[PDB]
Amino acid sequence: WLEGIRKWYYNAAGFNKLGLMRDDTIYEDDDVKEAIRRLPENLYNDRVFRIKRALDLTMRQQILPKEQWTKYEEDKFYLEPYLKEVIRERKEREEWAK
Amino acid sequence: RSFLCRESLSGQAAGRPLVASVGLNVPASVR
Amino acid sequence: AALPATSESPVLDAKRSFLCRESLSGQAAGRPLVASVGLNVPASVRY
Amino acid sequence: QDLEFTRLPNGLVIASLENYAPASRIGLFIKAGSRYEDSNNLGTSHLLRLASSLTTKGASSFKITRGIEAVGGKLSVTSTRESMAYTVECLRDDIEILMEFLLNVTAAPEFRRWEVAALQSQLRIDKAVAFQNPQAQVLENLHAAAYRNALANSLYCPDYRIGKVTPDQLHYYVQNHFTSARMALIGLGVSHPVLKQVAERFLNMRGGLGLSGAKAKYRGGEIRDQNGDSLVHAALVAESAATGSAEANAFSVLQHVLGAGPHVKRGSNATSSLYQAVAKGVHQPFDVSAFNASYSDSGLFGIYTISQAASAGDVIKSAYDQVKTIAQGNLSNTDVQAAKNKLKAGYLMSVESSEGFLDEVGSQALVAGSYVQPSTVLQQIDSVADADVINAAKKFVSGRKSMAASGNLGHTPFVDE
Amino acid sequence: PQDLEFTRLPNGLVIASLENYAPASRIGLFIKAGSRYEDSNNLGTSHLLRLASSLTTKGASSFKITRGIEAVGGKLSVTSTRESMAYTVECLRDDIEILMEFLLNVTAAPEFRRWEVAALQSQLRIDKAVAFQNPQAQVLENLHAAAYRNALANSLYCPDYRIGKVTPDQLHYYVQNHFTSARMALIGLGVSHPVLKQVAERFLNMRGGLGLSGAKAKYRGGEIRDQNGDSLVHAALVAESAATGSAEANAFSVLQHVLGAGPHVKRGSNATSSLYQAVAKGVHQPFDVSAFNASYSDSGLFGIYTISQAASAGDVIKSAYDQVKTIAQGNLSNTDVQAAKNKLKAGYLMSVESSEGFLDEVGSQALVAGSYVQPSTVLQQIDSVADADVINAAKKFVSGRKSMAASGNLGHTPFVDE
């Protein structure tokens, strides 16, 4: 089933190994930077700590133990609610320029 | 904008309560 | 001042918080304020 | 071709007049302002006033701005101590769009965190621009010194609340002081039916009277500050009567008996008793005028004065003495007739403009709850007798004073003298 | 060995010296040129003058002054109150002469060069910001503004509208009209009189008269309240007590120590302090009440200072005030009076023991009284105070115009009329 292949790919992706939440791995274009700026303080601080710890781990080429990996159902989508709004605003601006 | 004559000061003593006003296309005004 | 007073002058910096009755003891001025700023000495105030 | 004054069961007051004008203006007047600000949430009213272009529930900020500007309409949020007035003006063929925009702005805002936090910086700029006129600071200090609370709150955010007005405060203010019973929807150049439809289609979401404020206690302070500028903007007031009262009209007449404002460009204010009294004496640039500010609970009446730093002692004193003379039965009926004519003209003259008429009718709907034709106002003004002015002068004189000054206060007398 | 020898110079100067044979010697030139003498067109000049030390003088350049003062490792501190500035120098008794010369150059022949003052004017903002980090500074400034009308109302700090506009001519006029030979006291601890007389004849020859006389600080009774937003509401309610150095002044000091003025045991309970006990039976939240006594030359200010939480502030203002009223009708135990007298005598003696405290006390005595009284005289004067005077004292505080200053979240603080 589709969710099975999604979970298998989540395991094979690798950013779960570095304790990295899904939205942390997104590329940072203008929409993404504006979305990150829009984040609340607690979420921003958690995001920056996760990114810094992952950068440390990749510099030392190690991953956290089996227990402290982000699971499939613990991988919340925190950036998505703001990113979708930013995308909608950009699309509205383009449609007005249309 | 200074004032050093009666004619310039004339009309500068407020006699009505202040009413702030700001728009979206018009600059802010007070009275 | 060979001695650098005690508390220095961190302008644009928060003061020591409060929030305990004992720590708030005798903070109520009882004498007129006097200020002391001079050459080679941190500024101070006393009440 | 007349002014309908329907009142919805929610308490909303829909008033509309079809003047057949090329442009139309719709205004929503709300019983909200600095007078309803609590001590903890001071400055919320100013931020709300600065917050009219933000992303609403059904219209984004970009959409609001672009839609209002595309039809070339204007959106103002004129605010007083006891009333906040949203107003849209545009051509009578596009009123529907801006009316929807204003209805979304007033009724269903979002107050998103990022936008509010970014716009907090506008509070300082607007306050500085307003305070560039010495009258603004003097009047704010006057209200602070005269009233213990309620009306004491200034229209502008205090410096300690700039950057700390959370969106939760704005949300609480909106759901408390923007209820239907304390609003009035007015239209100039619009038909009553469509106004009723949009009213019951948007403003019905919040009902009830809302959070009620407290009365305005009258302390009688003497807030004084030294701003260095040569001109000394002083103002000495006392407790007048509340608006919509016989004594209110008596004080209004007393304002023009004393003289308030010029009438001839670069004139000498010959009829103004205060100006003539002060002119004999200080031969320096100056200005003195009566000052009336009648609010709902109560109001203030006194004298406002600009003068040279050294001369400030005389100008405040001499002008005051003039009022004393009026108190002791030195007012002629001819001056009473002149003041009544000036008042009648001023009232018929402020409602002359379409915006002025909208403001007059909005205030009438907000406070009284029933429109009054200008002729009735003129009859009320003429009904005032000389003895009432004579209170009137006593109540001003024999009452606790409240003084606010500015500039080089070296020679400015204190309230005790 | 040795005593505080006192000699008033014909010019008007008073030199008093005490050779205690201490390893370090201090010299304080006390000038009756405080902030009470600032007029309305020159407010803040005294503040800049306080920071104007170490600027290039007539005989010694600023670089020379700094290098000479600190190469010895000495001191140059200006302590200013509302009525009297005091320049003070401290070094070893071996290098006192250079310190005296530098002090006399900076206090007798200043230049106030245009560029120096222009550069120094930025430091006014920093000094005001650093001092005002303590809310008590704001509260006391507002109290003085709202209590006294003309003379003492001037702040110890330059108002924000005068920062940047303190012209050097203003400083020169202030010095020429207030730094007079008949308004100063050259006080020396650790030196000898002949040496202090030679430096007195060295420059110390300004106009010699009494300078520009001040004005009697009239009482106002106003109320200045600012809403700064910090949680801890500081409030202070005072009334015109009496001029310093009077029988009523001693009675008011005894009343202050009866009510309670600061803590004695660190982290104790202020059991003796009647105000603390009276308030504690009310609000059960962190607070601090204390009698605030100010005694200036012309008049004074006795009241209560209360740091309290925003919600409870009113209660703290009320009950404490009621406590004073309890004394006004007469509830003073003679044991309490004796305890307060002992506390006063102690506090005085333990304030004099320090060399700096001794110097300031002698300077104030020379400026105000014109003579010097030994500690035994002051203790005897305090002992002479009776209970009836301390009873206020209480009646005068209760029945009078009350000037109040408040700061914080003033959502519930009572007004003067309440």
Short mmCIF file of C-alpha atoms in Angstrom, two decimals, chain D:
data_model
loop_
_atom_site.label_atom_id
_atom_site.label_comp_id
_atom_site.label_asym_id
_atom_site.label_seq_id
_atom_site.Cartn_x
_atom_site.Cartn_y
_atom_site.Cartn_z
CA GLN D 1 -34.24 62.43 -0.05
CA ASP D 2 -34.46 62.33 3.75
CA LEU D 3 -32.52 60.71 6.60
CA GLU D 4 -33.89 57.37 7.78
CA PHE D 5 -32.85 56.30 11.29
CA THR D 6 -33.66 52.61 11.64
CA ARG D 7 -32.46 50.69 14.70
CA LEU D 8 -31.91 46.95 14.44
CA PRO D 9 -32.81 44.61 17.32
CA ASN D 10 -29.06 44.15 17.87
CA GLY D 11 -28.88 47.83 18.84
CA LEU D 12 -27.18 48.78 15.59
CA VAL D 13 -28.32 52.16 14.28
CA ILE D 14 -28.56 52.34 10.48
CA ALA D 15 -28.87 55.90 9.21
CA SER D 16 -28.64 56.73 5.52
CA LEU D 17 -29.34 59.77 3.38
CA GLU D 18 -29.64 59.77 -0.42
CA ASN D 19 -28.17 63.13 -1.38
CA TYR D 20 -27.75 62.01 -5.02
CA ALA D 21 -24.09 62.94 -4.83
CA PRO D 22 -21.47 61.73 -7.34
CA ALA D 23 -19.47 60.19 -4.48
CA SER D 24 -20.64 58.35 -1.37
CA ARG D 25 -19.15 57.88 2.10
CA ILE D 26 -20.03 55.10 4.54
CA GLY D 27 -18.96 55.36 8.16
CA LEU D 28 -19.09 52.90 11.04
CA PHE D 29 -18.91 54.70 14.39
CA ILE D 30 -18.02 52.61 17.44
CA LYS D 31 -18.12 53.44 21.16
CA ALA D 32 -14.44 52.59 21.49
CA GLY D 33 -11.35 54.63 22.22
CA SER D 34 -8.77 55.57 24.80
CA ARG D 35 -11.49 56.10 27.41
CA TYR D 36 -12.17 52.34 27.42
CA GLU D 37 -8.50 51.33 27.58
CA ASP D 38 -7.55 49.64 30.83
CA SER D 39 -4.27 50.35 32.60
CA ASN D 40 -2.76 47.01 31.56
CA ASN D 41 -3.69 47.38 27.87
CA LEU D 42 -2.97 51.09 27.36
CA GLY D 43 -2.25 52.00 23.76
CA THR D 44 -4.44 49.25 22.31
CA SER D 45 -6.82 51.82 20.83
CA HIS D 46 -3.99 53.60 19.01
CA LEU D 47 -2.74 50.33 17.55
CA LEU D 48 -6.24 49.36 16.43
CA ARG D 49 -6.56 52.75 14.75
CA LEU D 50 -3.26 52.12 12.98
CA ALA D 51 -4.57 48.60 12.19
CA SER D 52 -7.08 48.93 9.36
CA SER D 53 -5.13 47.51 6.40
CA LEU D 54 -4.19 44.16 7.94
CA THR D 55 -5.24 40.75 6.68
CA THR D 56 -8.88 40.23 7.61
CA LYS D 57 -10.84 36.99 7.73
CA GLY D 58 -12.01 37.27 4.12
CA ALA D 59 -9.67 39.82 2.55
CA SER D 60 -5.87 39.83 2.62
CA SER D 61 -3.89 43.00 3.25
CA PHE D 62 -2.70 43.10 -0.36
CA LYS D 63 -6.25 42.56 -1.61
CA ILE D 64 -7.63 45.24 0.71
CA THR D 65 -5.07 47.86 -0.32
CA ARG D 66 -5.19 47.08 -4.04
CA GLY D 67 -8.98 46.91 -4.14
CA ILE D 68 -9.44 50.19 -2.31
CA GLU D 69 -6.84 51.96 -4.45
CA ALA D 70 -8.00 50.52 -7.79
CA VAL D 71 -11.36 52.29 -7.45
CA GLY D 72 -9.57 55.28 -5.92
CA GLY D 73 -11.37 55.11 -2.58
CA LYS D 74 -10.23 56.36 0.80
CA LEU D 75 -10.32 54.60 4.18
CA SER D 76 -9.85 56.64 7.37
CA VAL D 77 -10.14 55.53 10.99
CA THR D 78 -10.71 58.92 12.68
CA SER D 79 -10.64 58.32 16.43
CA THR D 80 -11.54 60.33 19.53
CA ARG D 81 -11.41 59.53 23.23
CA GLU D 82 -14.96 58.10 23.21
CA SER D 83 -15.47 57.05 19.58
CA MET D 84 -13.62 55.33 16.75
CA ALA D 85 -14.94 56.10 13.27
CA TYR D 86 -14.10 53.97 10.26
CA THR D 87 -14.94 55.68 6.99
CA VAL D 88 -14.78 54.73 3.31
CA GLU D 89 -15.33 57.21 0.49
CA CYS D 90 -15.60 56.38 -3.20
CA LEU D 91 -17.66 56.90 -6.34
CA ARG D 92 -21.31 56.00 -5.92
CA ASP D 93 -20.98 53.12 -8.41
CA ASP D 94 -18.26 51.26 -6.48
CA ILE D 95 -19.47 51.66 -2.88
CA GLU D 96 -20.30 47.96 -2.52
CA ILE D 97 -16.69 46.77 -2.74
CA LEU D 98 -15.29 49.22 -0.19
CA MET D 99 -18.32 48.63 2.03
CA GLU D 100 -17.50 44.92 2.07
CA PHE D 101 -13.86 45.77 2.79
CA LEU D 102 -14.73 48.01 5.75
CA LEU D 103 -17.23 45.47 7.07
CA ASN D 104 -14.54 42.78 7.01
CA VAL D 105 -12.02 45.11 8.65
CA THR D 106 -14.26 46.15 11.54
CA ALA D 107 -16.10 42.88 12.18
CA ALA D 108 -13.71 40.02 11.32
CA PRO D 109 -10.01 40.87 11.63
CA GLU D 110 -7.21 38.37 12.17
CA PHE D 111 -4.42 40.40 13.84
CA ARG D 112 -1.73 38.02 12.62
CA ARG D 113 1.35 38.00 14.82
CA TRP D 114 3.95 38.90 12.19
CA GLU D 115 1.96 41.78 10.70
CA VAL D 116 1.08 43.31 14.07
CA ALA D 117 4.66 42.99 15.31
CA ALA D 118 5.99 44.59 12.13
CA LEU D 119 3.46 47.43 12.29
CA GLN D 120 4.20 48.26 15.95
CA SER D 121 6.98 50.50 14.59
CA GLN D 122 4.37 52.75 12.97
CA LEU D 123 3.07 53.72 16.42
CA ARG D 124 6.22 55.68 17.24
CA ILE D 125 6.27 57.48 13.89
CA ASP D 126 2.61 58.45 14.12
CA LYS D 127 2.97 59.61 17.72
CA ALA D 128 6.00 61.73 16.87
CA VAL D 129 4.25 63.30 13.88
CA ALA D 130 1.19 64.09 15.99
CA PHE D 131 3.30 65.47 18.84
CA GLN D 132 5.17 67.80 16.50
CA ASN D 133 2.21 70.11 17.19
CA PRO D 134 2.57 71.36 20.78
CA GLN D 135 -1.22 71.36 21.13
CA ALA D 136 -1.32 67.56 21.05
CA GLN D 137 1.04 67.05 23.99
CA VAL D 138 -0.60 69.83 25.98
CA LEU D 139 -4.08 68.39 25.48
CA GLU D 140 -2.89 64.88 26.36
CA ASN D 141 -1.31 66.16 29.57
CA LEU D 142 -4.50 68.14 30.20
CA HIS D 143 -6.63 65.00 30.04
CA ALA D 144 -4.12 63.08 32.15
CA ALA D 145 -4.05 65.76 34.85
CA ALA D 146 -7.77 66.56 34.83
CA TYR D 147 -9.24 63.04 34.88
CA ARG D 148 -8.08 60.25 37.16
CA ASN D 149 -9.02 57.53 34.67
CA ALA D 150 -11.13 56.73 31.59
CA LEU D 151 -10.75 59.94 29.59
CA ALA D 152 -7.24 60.33 31.01
CA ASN D 153 -5.90 57.73 28.58
CA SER D 154 -4.20 59.35 25.61
CA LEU D 155 -5.05 58.60 22.00
CA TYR D 156 -1.42 57.60 21.40
CA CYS D 157 0.53 54.61 22.68
CA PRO D 158 2.70 55.38 25.73
CA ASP D 159 6.41 54.92 25.08
CA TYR D 160 6.52 51.89 27.37
CA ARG D 161 3.84 50.04 25.37
CA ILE D 162 5.46 50.57 21.96
CA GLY D 163 6.27 47.03 20.83
CA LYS D 164 4.37 45.23 23.61
CA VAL D 165 0.77 45.49 22.36
CA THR D 166 0.13 41.81 21.70
CA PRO D 167 -2.52 40.72 19.17
CA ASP D 168 -4.42 39.14 22.06
CA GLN D 169 -5.08 42.62 23.44
CA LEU D 170 -6.45 43.73 20.07
CA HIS D 171 -8.63 40.62 19.83
CA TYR D 172 -10.00 41.20 23.32
CA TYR D 173 -10.66 44.87 22.51
CA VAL D 174 -12.51 43.92 19.32
CA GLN D 175 -14.68 41.24 20.91
CA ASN D 176 -15.44 43.54 23.85
CA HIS D 177 -15.95 47.13 22.65
CA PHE D 178 -17.08 46.45 19.06
CA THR D 179 -20.43 44.85 19.84
CA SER D 180 -23.49 45.73 17.80
CA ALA D 181 -25.25 47.74 20.52
CA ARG D 182 -22.37 50.26 20.59
CA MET D 183 -22.05 50.83 16.83
CA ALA D 184 -23.80 53.01 14.27
CA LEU D 185 -23.63 52.45 10.50
CA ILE D 186 -24.18 55.67 8.52
CA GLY D 187 -24.24 56.29 4.79
CA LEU D 188 -24.15 59.45 2.70
CA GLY D 189 -25.04 58.87 -0.92
CA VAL D 190 -26.37 55.35 -0.32
CA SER D 191 -29.80 53.75 -0.07
CA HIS D 192 -31.14 52.47 3.24
CA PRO D 193 -32.13 48.90 2.11
CA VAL D 194 -28.65 47.84 0.98
CA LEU D 195 -27.20 49.35 4.15
CA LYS D 196 -29.58 47.21 6.20
CA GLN D 197 -28.71 44.10 4.19
CA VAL D 198 -24.96 44.49 4.66
CA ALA D 199 -25.45 45.37 8.33
CA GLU D 200 -27.44 42.24 9.13
CA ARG D 201 -25.08 40.25 6.90
CA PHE D 202 -21.80 41.23 8.61
CA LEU D 203 -22.22 43.03 11.93
CA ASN D 204 -24.70 40.48 13.33
CA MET D 205 -21.89 38.11 14.35
CA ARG D 206 -21.25 40.00 17.61
CA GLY D 207 -24.14 41.21 19.74
CA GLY D 208 -24.83 42.59 23.18
CA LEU D 209 -23.79 45.83 24.80
CA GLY D 210 -20.19 44.77 25.40
CA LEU D 211 -17.65 45.62 28.07
CA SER D 212 -18.80 48.73 29.90
CA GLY D 213 -16.27 51.32 30.99
CA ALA D 214 -16.15 53.26 34.24
CA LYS D 215 -16.94 56.87 35.03
CA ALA D 216 -14.41 59.69 34.70
CA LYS D 217 -13.25 60.92 38.09
CA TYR D 218 -11.95 64.49 38.11
CA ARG D 219 -8.71 64.77 40.09
CA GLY D 220 -7.54 68.24 39.10
CA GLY D 221 -3.84 67.71 38.54
CA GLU D 222 -1.23 70.14 37.28
CA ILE D 223 0.94 68.07 34.93
CA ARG D 224 3.80 70.36 33.87
CA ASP D 225 6.75 69.66 31.58
CA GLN D 226 9.57 71.83 30.25
CA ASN D 227 10.16 71.50 26.50
CA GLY D 228 12.44 74.49 26.03
CA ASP D 229 10.54 76.09 23.15
CA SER D 230 9.81 79.77 23.70
CA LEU D 231 6.03 79.54 23.34
CA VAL D 232 4.30 78.41 26.54
CA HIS D 233 1.20 76.40 25.64
CA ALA D 234 -0.73 76.51 28.91
CA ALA D 235 -4.30 75.39 29.50
CA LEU D 236 -6.37 75.87 32.66
CA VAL D 237 -9.70 74.02 32.79
CA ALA D 238 -12.41 72.93 35.21
CA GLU D 239 -15.24 70.41 35.26
CA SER D 240 -18.01 71.39 32.85
CA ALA D 241 -21.29 69.57 32.30
CA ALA D 242 -21.83 66.44 30.24
CA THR D 243 -22.88 66.72 26.61
CA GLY D 244 -26.54 66.90 25.66
CA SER D 245 -27.45 69.10 28.62
CA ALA D 246 -28.70 72.63 29.14
CA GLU D 247 -25.47 73.47 30.97
CA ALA D 248 -23.56 71.97 28.04
CA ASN D 249 -25.16 74.51 25.71
CA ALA D 250 -24.57 77.23 28.30
CA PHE D 251 -20.86 76.39 28.31
CA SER D 252 -20.84 76.27 24.51
CA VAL D 253 -22.27 79.80 24.46
CA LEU D 254 -19.73 80.88 27.09
CA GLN D 255 -17.00 79.58 24.79
CA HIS D 256 -17.91 82.10 22.09
CA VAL D 257 -18.62 84.84 24.63
CA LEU D 258 -15.02 84.41 25.77
CA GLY D 259 -14.00 83.99 22.14
CA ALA D 260 -12.72 80.82 20.50
CA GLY D 261 -10.82 80.83 17.23
CA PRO D 262 -10.30 83.57 14.67
CA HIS D 263 -12.79 84.73 12.08
CA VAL D 264 -10.79 87.16 9.92
CA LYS D 265 -7.47 86.05 8.47
CA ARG D 266 -4.78 87.92 10.42
CA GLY D 267 -7.52 89.57 12.44
CA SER D 268 -7.52 91.10 15.90
CA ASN D 269 -10.45 89.20 17.49
CA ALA D 270 -12.29 92.41 18.37
CA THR D 271 -15.41 90.59 19.54
CA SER D 272 -13.34 88.03 21.46
CA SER D 273 -13.45 89.33 25.03
CA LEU D 274 -10.47 87.22 26.11
CA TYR D 275 -8.22 88.50 23.33
CA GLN D 276 -9.16 92.13 23.97
CA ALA D 277 -8.66 91.75 27.72
CA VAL D 278 -5.23 90.14 27.30
CA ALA D 279 -4.13 92.58 24.58
CA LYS D 280 -4.38 95.39 27.11
CA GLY D 281 -1.32 94.39 29.07
CA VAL D 282 1.13 92.04 27.35
CA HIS D 283 2.43 93.66 24.14
CA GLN D 284 4.04 90.44 22.92
CA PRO D 285 2.95 87.79 20.41
CA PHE D 286 0.31 85.64 22.06
CA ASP D 287 -3.03 83.90 21.67
CA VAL D 288 -5.81 83.05 24.12
CA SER D 289 -9.01 81.14 23.42
CA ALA D 290 -11.81 79.43 25.27
CA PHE D 291 -11.58 75.64 25.38
CA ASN D 292 -14.59 73.31 25.56
CA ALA D 293 -14.44 69.52 25.42
CA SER D 294 -17.70 67.82 26.40
CA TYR D 295 -17.63 64.03 26.63
CA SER D 296 -20.34 61.55 27.59
CA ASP D 297 -19.86 61.25 31.35
CA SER D 298 -18.58 64.80 31.87
CA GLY D 299 -16.37 67.39 30.25
CA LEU D 300 -13.82 70.18 30.60
CA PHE D 301 -14.04 73.92 30.07
CA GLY D 302 -11.30 76.50 30.42
CA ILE D 303 -8.79 78.69 28.64
CA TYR D 304 -5.96 77.74 26.28
CA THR D 305 -3.04 80.10 25.88
CA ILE D 306 0.15 80.45 23.84
CA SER D 307 2.53 83.18 24.95
CA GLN D 308 6.15 84.17 25.30
CA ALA D 309 8.06 82.47 28.10
CA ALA D 310 8.37 85.62 30.21
CA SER D 311 4.85 86.90 29.52
CA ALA D 312 3.14 83.62 30.47
CA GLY D 313 2.44 84.89 33.98
CA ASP D 314 0.27 87.75 32.78
CA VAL D 315 -1.52 86.07 29.87
CA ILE D 316 -2.82 83.18 31.96
CA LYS D 317 -3.72 85.53 34.80
CA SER D 318 -5.26 88.41 32.85
CA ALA D 319 -7.42 86.12 30.70
CA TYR D 320 -8.55 84.34 33.86
CA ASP D 321 -9.55 87.68 35.37
CA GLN D 322 -11.77 88.29 32.35
CA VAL D 323 -13.76 85.15 33.13
CA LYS D 324 -14.06 86.38 36.71
CA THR D 325 -15.64 89.57 35.39
CA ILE D 326 -18.13 87.50 33.39
CA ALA D 327 -18.95 85.58 36.57
CA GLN D 328 -19.86 88.74 38.47
CA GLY D 329 -22.65 89.75 36.11
CA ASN D 330 -20.62 91.74 33.56
CA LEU D 331 -22.05 90.05 30.45
CA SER D 332 -24.17 92.10 28.05
CA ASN D 333 -27.08 90.66 26.09
CA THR D 334 -25.52 91.96 22.87
CA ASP D 335 -22.47 89.76 23.43
CA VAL D 336 -24.86 86.89 24.16
CA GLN D 337 -26.61 87.42 20.82
CA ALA D 338 -23.27 87.63 19.01
CA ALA D 339 -22.07 84.40 20.62
CA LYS D 340 -25.36 82.66 19.82
CA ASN D 341 -25.07 83.74 16.18
CA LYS D 342 -21.48 82.48 16.08
CA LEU D 343 -22.51 79.14 17.60
CA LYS D 344 -25.45 78.69 15.23
CA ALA D 345 -23.20 79.52 12.29
CA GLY D 346 -20.50 77.15 13.50
CA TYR D 347 -22.92 74.25 13.82
CA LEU D 348 -24.61 74.88 10.47
CA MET D 349 -21.11 75.30 9.05
CA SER D 350 -19.41 72.12 10.28
CA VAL D 351 -22.20 69.96 8.82
CA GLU D 352 -21.76 71.86 5.56
CA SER D 353 -19.15 69.40 4.30
CA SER D 354 -20.26 65.86 3.53
CA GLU D 355 -17.63 64.47 5.90
CA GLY D 356 -18.74 66.96 8.55
CA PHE D 357 -22.37 65.92 8.15
CA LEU D 358 -21.37 62.26 8.41
CA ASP D 359 -19.43 62.95 11.60
CA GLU D 360 -22.30 64.95 13.12
CA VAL D 361 -24.88 62.25 12.39
CA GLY D 362 -22.51 59.53 13.58
CA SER D 363 -21.95 61.27 16.90
CA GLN D 364 -25.70 61.81 17.27
CA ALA D 365 -26.39 58.13 16.63
CA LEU D 366 -23.61 57.03 18.99
CA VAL D 367 -24.46 59.25 21.97
CA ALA D 368 -28.10 60.29 21.79
CA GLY D 369 -29.38 57.45 19.64
CA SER D 370 -31.72 59.69 17.62
CA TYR D 371 -30.92 62.20 14.91
CA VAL D 372 -31.76 65.86 15.53
CA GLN D 373 -32.31 68.28 12.67
CA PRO D 374 -30.11 71.40 12.56
CA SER D 375 -33.14 73.63 13.18
CA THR D 376 -33.75 71.92 16.52
CA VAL D 377 -30.10 72.51 17.45
CA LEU D 378 -30.50 76.19 16.58
CA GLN D 379 -33.64 76.40 18.72
CA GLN D 380 -31.78 74.76 21.61
CA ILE D 381 -28.92 77.25 21.23
CA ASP D 382 -31.33 80.20 21.18
CA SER D 383 -33.11 78.82 24.25
CA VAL D 384 -30.01 79.56 26.35
CA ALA D 385 -30.42 82.68 28.50
CA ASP D 386 -27.84 85.14 29.80
CA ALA D 387 -28.23 83.92 33.38
CA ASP D 388 -27.21 80.39 32.41
CA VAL D 389 -23.93 81.69 30.97
CA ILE D 390 -23.45 83.93 34.01
CA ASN D 391 -23.90 80.07 36.65
CA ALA D 392 -21.68 78.64 33.91
CA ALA D 393 -18.93 81.18 34.57
CA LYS D 394 -19.37 80.65 38.31
CA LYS D 395 -19.06 76.87 37.95
CA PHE D 396 -15.86 77.36 35.98
CA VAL D 397 -14.47 79.83 38.51
CA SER D 398 -15.51 78.13 41.77
CA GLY D 399 -14.29 74.66 40.86
CA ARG D 400 -11.15 72.59 41.18
CA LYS D 401 -8.78 73.53 38.38
CA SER D 402 -6.60 71.42 36.10
CA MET D 403 -3.56 72.94 34.40
CA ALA D 404 -1.30 71.60 31.66
CA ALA D 405 1.69 73.61 30.42
CA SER D 406 4.63 73.21 28.05
CA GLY D 407 7.80 74.98 27.01
CA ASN D 408 10.03 77.14 29.19
CA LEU D 409 7.91 77.18 32.35
CA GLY D 410 10.14 79.56 34.29
CA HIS D 411 7.51 82.26 34.76
CA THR D 412 4.37 80.16 34.27
CA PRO D 413 2.20 80.47 37.40
CA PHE D 414 1.09 77.36 39.23
CA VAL D 415 -2.52 76.28 39.71
CA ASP D 416 -2.49 77.47 43.33
CA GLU D 417 -2.15 81.05 42.08
#
